[PDB]
Amino acid sequence: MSKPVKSKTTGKNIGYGKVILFGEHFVVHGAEAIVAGISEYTECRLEINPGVPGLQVDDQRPAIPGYIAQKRDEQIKAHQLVLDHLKVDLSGDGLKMFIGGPLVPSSGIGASASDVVAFSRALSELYQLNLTDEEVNLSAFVGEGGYHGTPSGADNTAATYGGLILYRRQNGKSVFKPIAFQQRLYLVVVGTGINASTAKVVNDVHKMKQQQPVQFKRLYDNYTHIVSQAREALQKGDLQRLGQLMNANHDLCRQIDVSCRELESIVQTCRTYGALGAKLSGTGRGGIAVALAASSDQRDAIVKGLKAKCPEAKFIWRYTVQPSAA
C-alpha cells in the first residue's frame, strides 16, 4: 500500500474539460476524430484526515443544477476505483477532498474524466507516486469505469493531456496522438439540459448501418473527406475553413439522425451571429453544441445573440483551446 508522504497538496492538480470538434459517432466505425482538451479545468486538493477513515468529498465545482447530486453514486465508485488502482488505503486515516476549478460539469463536457484525472494527479502528489502522464491517464481510465458505461478513452486522454488530439480506433483499440496548432480557438459551448445515452444512440447508428449499408457507407466516406480537410485547415491555421467543415460535419450528423430540435436551434443562432462553424458535440440528441468564434469580441456577439434569441441555449459557456506551440 502507498503511505501518504505529504499532509496536504500544494500543487495545481487539474483535469481539462473536453469537446469533440470532429467525428463523434463516425469514429465508432473507424473514422478519425478530433477532440479538444480545453483550458478550463477541474482541480482536486487533498489533505490527510487523521483518525477519520475514508474519503470526505467537498464538491464545489460550478456544476449545472442537479448534476452533482445525480452523479454522486457514480463518483463514489469512480474514486474508489482510483484509490484501489493506486493502492491507497483509507481504512485508518482518511482524506479530505476539495473539488474546484472553473469547468462546469454538464453532460458532454467530459467532466467525470476531469474529476478522476485531477484526483489521480493529487493522489500522485500526496503519496509522491511521480505518475507519468501515461500513468495518470490509465488511472483516470480505470476510474471512469465507475461512471455509466463505457469509456472509449477520449475523455480521460483529453483531460490528462489537453490540446487538440487525433482519436481513432486503430488497429483494434483507441489510438491517440497530439495535433500541433499555432492559434487559439475561441469556443462557445452550449448545454441543452437534455441527457442522452451514448450506448443507446450509438446502437441506433449501428442499426441504421445494418438497415442501410450503402447509404451509411456514403455518409461515412463523406465524413472521412471532411476530417482530412479539417486536419489540413489546422496545420495551415485556417479557421474560417475549419468552421465551414464543422458545419459540414454537423450536416452529416443530422443525416445519421443524432441531432434534435434544441441542437438545431442553437447551431442556427450561432451561425446567425457570425460563428465560423457550429455543430453538435458528442452523443447528440441533447447534450452540448460547440461554436467556433473568430476572436474574443465576436464570441461576445454570439453569447449575446444566443441569450436574446435562443431559449434552447440553456447554459452558455466561453471555453478555449490553447495553442500547442508558438
Numbering used by the authors: 1 to 326
The authors write:
Recombinant LmMK and a selenomethionine (SeMet) derivative produced ordered, isomorphous monoclinic crystals and a single-wavelength anomalous dispersion (SAD) experiment provided initial phase information to solve the structure. The SAD approach was required because molecular replacement calculations using known MK structures failed. Although the non-hydrolysable ATP analogue adenosine 5'-(β,γ-imido) triphosphate (AMPPNP) and (R/S)-MVA were included in crystallization solutions there was no indication of ordered ligand binding. There are two molecules in the asymmetric unit (A and B) related by a non-crystallographic (NCS) two-fold axis of symmetry and the surface area between the two is 930 Å2 per molecule, only 6% of the total surface area of the protein. Such a low value is consistent with results from gel filtration and ultracentrifugation experiments that indicate LmMK is a monomer in solution. Molecules A and B overlay with an r.m.s.d. of 1.2 Å for all atoms. Molecule A of LmMK binds the substrate and overlays on the apo-enzyme molecule A with an r.m.s.d. of 0.7 Å for all atoms. This indicates that there no large-scale conformational changes result from substrate binding and the molecules are so similar that it is only necessary to detail molecule A. The replacement of the insert and two helical segments in the rat enzyme with the short loop connecting β3-α2 in LmMK results in a polypeptide conformation, not observed in structures of GHMP kinases, that lies across and restricts access to the ATP binding cavity. Despite our efforts, extending to the complete structural analysis of several diffraction datasets (not shown), we were unable to obtain a binary structure of LmMK in complex with ATP, any nucleotide, or a ternary dead-end complex.
